[PDB]
């Protein structure tokens, strides 16, 4: 058993490393997913401003008219 | 021995990935700031002369 | 291995501090830049109001 053991021991010791880094990896990939989610939310803030630009367009037409009238 | 290379691997598993991804974030942020400035400039200067002329 | 795990848990604890304190200071810098960008508004706006009157 001491011989088969060598294989069992090396695999758990490395399997543990899968976990040693997966613990770092999940935190990293979760970060990426999360940041992509944040980027939307901040893009939406910019989209609020996009609508403001259309409000400005109407304001501009009103001024063209009131300034002329 | 590999346990030591493996603890060292946190740096060789590339701490600099952080530096690289961060650099990409600092970078892309600036690239997109320039795109913003361009769109903001389109709007910021498109005005006013008619009103002041009128 | 008992000894090496001591060393490489110690290195780990050291890295915990190094990585998080490096990042902490990097955010302090970005934070102040952004916050200052906000405070300069208010510094300018005092005169914006005066300018608006005339």
């Amino acid at each position: 058993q001491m011989q088969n053991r060598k294989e069992e021991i090396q695999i758990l010791e490395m399997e543990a490393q899968a976990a040693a880094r997966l613990r770092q990896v999940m935190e990293l990939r979760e970060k990426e997913d999360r940041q992509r989610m944040v980027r939307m939310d901040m893009d939406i803030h910019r989209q609020q401003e996009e609508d403001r630009d259309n409000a400005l367009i109407q304001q501009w037409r009103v001024e063209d008219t009131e300034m002329r009238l | 021995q590999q346990m030591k290379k493996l603890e060292e691997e946190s740096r060789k598993a590339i701490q600099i990935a952080e530096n690289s991804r961060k650099a990409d974030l600092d970078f892309i942020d600036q690239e997109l700031q320039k795109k913003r400035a361009n769109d903001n400039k389109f709007i910021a200067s498109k005005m006013e002369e008619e009103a002041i002329l009128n | 291995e008992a000894i090496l795990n001591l060393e490489l848990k110690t290195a780990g604890r050291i890295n915990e501090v190094l990585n998080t304190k490096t990042k902490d200071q990097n955010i302090q810098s970005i934070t102040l830049q952004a916050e200052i960008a906000q405070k300069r508004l208010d510094m300018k706006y005092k005169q914006m109001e005066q300018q608006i009157d005339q």
Binding site: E49, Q59, E63 | Q33, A44, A51 | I52
Partner: peptide, 23 residues
């Protein structure tokens, strides 16, 4: 990024305000 954006975007108002003030 968003703050400097917001600021420079905000000041477009001041230019709009200049037009509104004019009339």
């Amino acid at each position: 990024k968003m703050l400097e954006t917001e600021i420079l975007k905000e000041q477009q108002m001041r230019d709009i305000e200049r037009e509104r003030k004019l009339r």
